[PDB]
Amino acid sequence: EDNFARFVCKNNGVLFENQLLQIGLKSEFRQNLGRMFIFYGNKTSTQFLNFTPTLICADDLQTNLNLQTKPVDPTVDGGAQVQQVINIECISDFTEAPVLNIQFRYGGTFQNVSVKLPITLNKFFQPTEMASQDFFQRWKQLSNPQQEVQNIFKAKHPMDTEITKAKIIGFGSALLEEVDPNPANFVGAGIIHTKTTQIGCLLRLEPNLQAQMYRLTLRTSKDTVSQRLCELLSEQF
């Protein structure tokens, strides 16, 4: 399998490695766009032939996310690496992830890998710094109850405050300081950018030190965006 979950809050690293091939990633996002560099490393001493990487999207996913790539070099020498550049365009908010399928010939045999690519909605965030009075005026403007999504869950990791802070920044929103009157809480704000619509997002993360649990709350201008962002961010703490 792959390292998908490690890429919600970070962009660079090893996505997958078997005993023949290592797949590395480097990505950068801006506005509703991104560019992902995929690195294919041959760990063996023999060249791969008919090297064919294919990006597969559910058809519902294709209406929301446009991926473009140019053909990759089809021969990968042993001990070498080849690069693929994926240009991304977010059309509308989405939950599904694309699947990278890699097919190649090695030592006379057919090799087939499939792994989930880490393109998730939070990658299209613009951080938005704001003052306490601003944050609360916007938080108290929600009207539709499905635009608020709450999750109370057990902590997977120790409540180490600086690590928590750095995860919130890697997720993509701004981390607002001394906005919540409770100093143990964490507050964030940003905008999710898409071709068709720009979605305003607020978040609140409340630790319970005795129970080693958290309550996360998302308030956004779109129900599905509140839902996807809450499920993604809940898995980080």
How far apart the termini lie comes to: 22 Å
Return the CATH class of the largest domain. Mainly Beta
Largest sheet: 6 strands, antiparallel
Q: Which CATH architecture of the largest domain would you pick? A: Sandwich
The H/E string reads EEEEHEEEEEHEHEEEEH
Radius of gyration: 20 Å
Query: Count of helical segments?
Result: 4
The number of E-state strands comes to 14
How many structurally independent domains? 2
Structural class computed from helices and strand pairing: alpha+beta
CATH fold descriptor of the largest domain: Immunoglobulin-like
Proportion of helical residues: 10-25%
What do we call the CATH homologous superfamily of the largest domain? Gamma-adaptin ear (GAE) domain
Binned strand content: 35-45%
Shape: elongated
Keywords: Cell membrane, Coated pit, Endocytosis, Lipid-binding, Membrane, Protein transport, Transport
Subcellular location: Cell membrane; Membrane, Coated pit
Protein name: AP-2 complex subunit alpha-2
GO molecular function: clathrin adaptor activity; disordered domain specific binding; kinase binding; lipid binding; protein domain specific binding; protein kinase binding
Describe the protein in words.
Helices cover 16% and strands 44% of the residues. The protein is α+β, with helices and mostly antiparallel strands and 237 residues long. The relative contact order is 0.16. It has 4 helices and 14 strands. The chain folds into 2 domains: 1-124, Immunoglobulin-like; 125-237, TATA-Binding Protein, CATH 3.30.310. It is elongated, with a radius of gyration of 20 Å. Strands 9, 10, 11, 12, 13 and 14 form a 6-stranded antiparallel sheet that branches. Strands 1-2-3-6-5 form a 5-stranded antiparallel sheet. A 3-stranded antiparallel sheet has the order 4-7-8, with no helix packed on it. It is classed as endocytosis/exocytosis. Keywords: endocytosis, adaptor, endocytosis-exocytosis complex. The assembly is monomeric. The entry is titled "alpha-adaptin appendage domain, from clathrin adaptor AP2". The protein: protein (alpha-adaptin appendage domain).
